[PDB]
Every structure is written in C-alpha cells, then in structure tokens.
Chains A and B, each alone.
Chain A
Amino acid sequence: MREVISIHVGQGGIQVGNACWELFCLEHGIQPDGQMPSDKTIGGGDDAFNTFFSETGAGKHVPRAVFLDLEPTVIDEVRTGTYRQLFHPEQLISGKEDAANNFARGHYTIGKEIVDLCLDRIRKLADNCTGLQGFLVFNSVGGGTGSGLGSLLLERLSVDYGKKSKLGFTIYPSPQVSTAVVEPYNSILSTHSLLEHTDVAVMLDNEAIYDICRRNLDIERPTYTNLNRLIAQVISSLTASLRFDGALNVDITEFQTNLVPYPRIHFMLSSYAPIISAEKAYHEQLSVAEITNSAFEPANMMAKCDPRHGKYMACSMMYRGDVVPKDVNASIATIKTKRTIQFVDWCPTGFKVGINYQPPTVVPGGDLAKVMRAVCMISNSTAIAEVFSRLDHKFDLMYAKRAFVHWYVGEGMEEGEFSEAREDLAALEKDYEEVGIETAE
C-alpha cells in the first residue's frame, strides 16, 4: 500500500545500508533470522513493517531493498553476517572487479555488466509491491560504483517507472577531508548525469559526523560504525509517517515539489538531534525548544556548509514522540524570529509539520542517549552552492592539468562530458545564484 525500497552501492554506502536494516529490524524488533519473537495480531487502520520487511507464509520477513556494487568483498560479510538468515540470496547482486573509482568504468565499462540483473530484481520487488511510493537509493561518490553504476541505475530506473519518488542518500566529498583526489571527477561526472535523473536527495558529509559525535555524542574515536549508526537514525525518522501514527503523517511525494519549490536545486541539509550521552541524557531535560532551537544551530548543521551563509527555503521538522502542535508551533514562530536567518522571501514560509507520536528507539551498543522527541530538519537554503564551487574549482584546475584523464578517456568517456559537466555546475551555480536573488520591488 505504502512501499519504499532501498538500494545500496559504494563501500560506505552499503555500510550505511547494513546499519539501516539492522536498525529497522531492531525497531520493529523482528529477530534477525526473519521472525518476530511472537505472533502478529490481525488489525487495521494503517500498515506496519509490510512496507519493507517482507511477509512470508511464516516467520521470514525480509527487507524490500537491494544491494548492488562491483566491489563484492565486504557485502559477503553480510553474506556471512548474523543476518544471513535475514536477507535473501537474490537480494544480493555484486560485481567482482569494482570501478577502481573510475566513474566511467562501473558506469560505462562495468556499467554494462550487471544492469539487467539489477532491473530484473527491481521488477521482482515492485511487482511484489503495490503502492510503492518511491525509491531508496544509496551510494557514494567514493566506492566508485556508488557514483558510476548508480548513475546509470537511476538513469534507467527513472525511465522505467518514473512516477515513483527518488529518495536520494549519497555521500558528498567532505570539504577538506577526503578519500581520493579523482573525487572531482566522480562527483561532477555524476552530477550532470545525476540531476536530471534525480528527483531529490540529501548530501551527507562525514566531518560533521565526526565533530558532532565527538562533541554531542561525546565520542572519542569514531568510524563508519558510528556514522552508519547516525544516518541510520536520520533515515529511521525520515519515513516514520508511513510506519507509525503521527499527527501530520506527511509523505515523500508530499515533500517533493514543496520542499524543493523549483525543479532544479532539489537537495538539502539534515541536522538530526537530539544526540547526547547517557551522562547528558541526565544532567539534561531536552525540551522541544531545545531540540528546536538546537535544530538550527549552524554548528549543529549535519553537513559542512554554513546555513548562516545561506538563506533557508523550507524546513520539514518531522518529530518523533510526545510533540505538541502548539509548542513546536511557537518554536516555529521563534524560527521566524531568528534575525540571522533569511528566507527565500518569495517563499515566505514553506513549513510543513511532522509530529509522529513514537519517540525514538535506541540501538544497544550505541552512543546516542535515549530521549522522547526527535527532529529532522530537512531544510533547503542558498548556502550549499559554495562547497560545490570548491568542487568545480579544485576539479577545475586538476582537470585543467589533464590529471588522471587518461584513466577515464581510456574507458570510454569524451572530453566534452567534462567541460560540459562543468557547464552543468555552471548552470546550477546560476541557480543558487538566481533563486537567492530577491525578487525586485
């Protein structure tokens, strides 16, 4: 009735996915094998797990998500891991020789190799599904298939269904921290082929995960376990409406042309809170106002792009748990109140409340403390264009020096893809350039 499905790519990406399905399975508490601890009573009023966990004729409830990546080592760990009763073989599609972070390889070269298997799996699930709203696709501009092969993936999947929503979680090159140097190539080559195949998607950067887990989670020494846990929470709440009763169970498609008013600049930030320790869970109270005012801390901004340097457009503060329409509401007045913040005035307010009544659940072994209320500030501003500009200037020079270009030209891409894709970020620079212009008079 209300389905979504997750797709996983790139090393960090399927790392995220593993964390996620660990999470949801924890949260509905269905045991890793595929059974719930106990029988399910027959009831109505709304869906349940049925969105994602797959009903069998018995205690076998597998996700509705798919793995695809050409670097097949790690995924085997899932193939080995505790959830080897959880998942399902045909759920698993991997490539042996990954891209080597040639975008053009797993996009072009090995792009040709596994696509059809992917699409068949997709047809099996969507055919298995009925009211699948949209598509959860995860990848990374690092684990190279996460850029290339995913690029073809949406490039064709969109042309397959279209009417489904594109739920885009991919990681963005951290501003000064990194993984490689061809990242310019991965990213921008992705981007010009990303945009028109993307509906909307958010940009998760890691350095924020570090700084904030270390200060706010009080973390001393983190890694992808903590990161994947954190994105696990954020996606855990970004879709609760289709999973749990909330006052305004807003929906993705609902989010689509309302958060991203124009068609073009359709990405965003997301600073979840309240992430604190057990020793800050106590020694604190964690007000709605604390999560709320705290929600707009630029230093809390969960992607390393200063909001205060941008002007907000929309903010879908979907809330978990014991939320009051009034209290949050006045907090939103407080958000109108913030002098430092500046909004796409031709969209004076574009707010859209989310009050889901389940407060958050915590993953044992985790660092986040337990609370009563969650916020997701999926918000869109002018600010985020800048780091892009860093990307196209860095890539600008490096590409000017023809660095690495032999690698890509060797695999079947043309140079005008490069300069033209730079025209692509040129245009989007005109977009964040223009939409931020205040309409005259």
Chain B
Amino acid sequence: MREIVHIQGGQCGNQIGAKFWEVISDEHGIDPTGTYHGDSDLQLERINVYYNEATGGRYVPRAILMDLEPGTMDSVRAGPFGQLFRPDNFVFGQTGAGNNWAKGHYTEGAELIDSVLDVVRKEAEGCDCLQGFQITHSLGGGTGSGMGTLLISKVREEYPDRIMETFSVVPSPKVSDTVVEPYNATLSVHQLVENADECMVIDNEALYDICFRTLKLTTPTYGDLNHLVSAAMSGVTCCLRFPGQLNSDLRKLAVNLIPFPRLHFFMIGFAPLTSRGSQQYRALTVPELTQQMFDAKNMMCAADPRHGRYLTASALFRGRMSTKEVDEQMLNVQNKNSSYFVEWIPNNIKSSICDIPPKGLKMAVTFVGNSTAIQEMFKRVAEQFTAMFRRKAFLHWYTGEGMDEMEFTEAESNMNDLVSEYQQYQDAT
C-alpha cells in the first residue's frame, strides 16, 4: 500500500528510531500496549503503512533492529512502548563493530547479515505494495554503517524497485567524536553514492545550535534531538499517511527533487521551533514559518545555503490553511533571494500540504531543499582522511581487517569526483 519498514543500526540511530516510532505512536494515539485509544479512524485508515495489526489488535511496527551488541536491544527493550514491539526483530550482535567499518562490514559485517536479511525478507512478504523502508545509522563509523552498507547493497539488489531513504549521522567539522571517522565515512560514502536512493544529512552541532539558540535550551542530549529529527522524518510521509489538497510522495519527491541520481544527499528544515515564551511574542502564519524556512540556522546540516546555491528546494506543509497564501510566499521567496536559487531550474521551489498538521500544532512546515553547499563537508572529511592517510594513522587497526588501501583511493577520488561534480552543476548557467 506504499507501506514501509524501518531498519536502524548506529551508535545513536538505534536510539533514534526508538524515539521515532515513539512519536508515530503518539500521532496514532495507540496505547503502549498496542491497541488504539484515539478518536478518529483516520489514524487507523492509513495505520498499516507503518504499523501492523496483530491477532487481537497488537499493533506493531515494521521496524528492523540492527546492532552488534545487545545493550541497545535491552535499552529500547527497556523502552516505554516496549510492549508495543515484536520480540522477533531484536536482531543484534555479540561483539560490536569497534567502529572499524571493515569489522562491521566484513568481519561482523558478513557474520550477522544473513539472519537480518532473512527476517527482513519475511517482512518483505509482509508488505503488499511496499513503497519502501527507512534505514538509519551514522556515516562516520560502523555501529550502523558497518552493516548498513551491506544492507543497502543486499536489499538494493534484492529490491531494485524499492526506495532507500537513508539518514545517517555526519561528523560535524569541529568536534571529532572519533578520528577513524574519515575512513569509515569515506569507505561508506563510496557505497552510499552508488546504492542509496535518498539521503539527508545528520549533524549534531546543528541540533545543538537549534536546541541552544533557537530552542533556547541549555541541556542537550540525544533524545530531544531525535525528537527534533523524527519530527521531520515523521512528517515526511504525512500525505502518504493522510489526505492533502496538495500531495506528493517520496517518488514524487525525489523524482521532483533530484536532477541526476548522485544528488540524494539533502538538507533539512523543520519548524516552528520556540521556547515557551515565544508564542507570547509571536503567532503562526504560513509567511512566518516561511520566514523560518530559509533560515541557515534551521539549515540543520554542515552546508550553508548562504554560501552554496539552492539546486532545489521544497516545503512540506501539514495543517489547514490557504494555499493561496502558500504558493504566494513560495514564489515570493523564490524571487527574494533568487541568487541562491540555481538558475535553469525554473520554479526550483515546489509545494505540498497535508490536511492535518502534526499533533499539538496547527500548521506544519518542512524543508528538504538541496543546494550544493555540502562540498565543504566532503572536502573537510576527505581532507582529514587525506592527512592521516598520508600518515596511515590507525591503518593498523584498519589493514588488520584485511581491506586494501586502493579501496580508500576508490572512495577517495570517487568522493572528490562527486564534489567537483557538484561544482560544475553549481558553476553553470
């Protein structure tokens, strides 16, 4: 039915989806136990395309658990809504990748892929007209990417028609949570540029910036952050989940978002984002949220539209309004800062609306535009990879996995090729 599935690895991402399904449960108001306690059939109408009824009305996720060590499995296993799960999917590891990506990709990569792809495949038979599935990990290591690389390869072959919308955490330029990041990252991204269908960037520092400045929060954790992102990743299917006077699916999205298949790394904007007092400063209009939409500070990725140029831009609106406003602000904005709008893409802004906003708010905005400002991102990470690969720093942890360096060259001149590729598209008219 255009239903989809979720698969998460990732040192964080395993938590991320926990929050995610948590949020969707709220938007479906079904008890933690797994039965519905809401007030409209509309939550039940399209419930299946994420959930699954069970005998007795156990309502369940179409999620897939990735992990190389059960702790997360216990963690979310210790999770509220944990009784809303299926024990089947608790597919984890006994070792951990140690985030040498070769470890999580050959060593443990080849070790535990099979049981996953089997049960996942059983989910594939459980899906009537599968629009797709949602993968989640991080692009700097192996706790997610280790195996998730193998996932994208295997299912991608196994389902060359299905959509692969991939969110994985990008290392911020400043803070290096690990120094093996350039290598895991580069080795992964070689794969992901080939095999993944959609990708959107996952920085932490942006999420900090949101929580601290625009959220005006002092105490950052993951969980709030995954609230902030699963807000958007939860919004994305809204029309696909719920009616909309102007609907567009991921196929309409990506096909209406990408000129050439190498450009499915997208940046993200969601809003509104206030602290409590703000409403008693300000109110909500479509033009208002628009005035956030093109905010670099909501630009939750390491790329700057202020520095790069919008190759593409789009808006995901959930609520009840007048599109006569919506479009009007659209075109207005597409003029107002025309210069950061790439040229030969006429009407490079594109529209949407969901008859219902997310719960709690009256109107919704989402922006997954695609400039080319990410070039500094790949340039950076490739740069650090370059330095220590001059040094071969921690190659020994690496070659101990029994990869070659020439692969590193492959993702290397590879990833540079993708960058310059974005250069010419940005530098053209």
Contact = CB atoms under 8 A, between A and B. Distances in A.
Interface in A298-329: 314, 324-326, 329
A166 B397 CA distance: 15
A44 B178 contact: no
B177 A351 contact: yes
A254 interface: yes
A254 B69 CA distance: 12
A57 interface: no
A44 B78 contact: yes
Interface stretch (A23-31, A62-70, A245-253): A245-253
Given A257-B394, A261-B396, A324-B219, A348 B388 contact: yes
Interface in B358-392: 384, 387-388, 390-392
Given A325-B220, A346-B387, A261 B393 contact: yes
A352 B143 CA distance: 14
Interface size class, chain A: 35 or more
A333 B175 contact: yes
A262 interface: yes
Nearest to A336: B174
B175 A347 contact: no
B188 interface: no
Interface string B205-249: 000100110000001111000000000000000000000000000
A257 B396 contact: yes
Interface residues of B, number: 43
A325 B204 contact: yes
A366 interface: no
A46 B73 CA distance: 8
A45 B177 contact: no
A419 interface: no
Contacts of B398: 257
- Classify the interface of chain B: helix, strand, loop or mixed: loop
Contacts of B47: none
B98 interface: yes
A183 B219 CA distance: 51
Contacts of B384: 348-349
A46 B71 contact: yes
Nearest to B172: A329
A336 B180 CA distance: 17
Residue picked from A1, A45, A249, A333, most chain B C-beta under 10 Å:
A45
A346 B396 CA distance: 14
A258 B222 contact: no
A60 to B, nearest CB: 25
A262 B396 contact: yes
The 9 closest A-B pairs by CB, nearest first: A257-B397, A45-B74, A350-B179, A346-B391, A349-B176, A261-B394, A45-B78, A326-B220, A254-B98
28 contacts: A43-B78, A44-B74, A45-B73, A45-B75, A46-B70, A46-B74, A46-B75, A247-B221, A254-B98, A257-B100, A257-B400, A258-B98, A258-B99, A261-B393, A262-B393, A262-B396, A314-B179, A325-B222, A326-B212, A329-B208, A332-B175, A333-B175, A344-B391, A344-B393, A350-B394, A351-B176, A351-B178, A439-B391
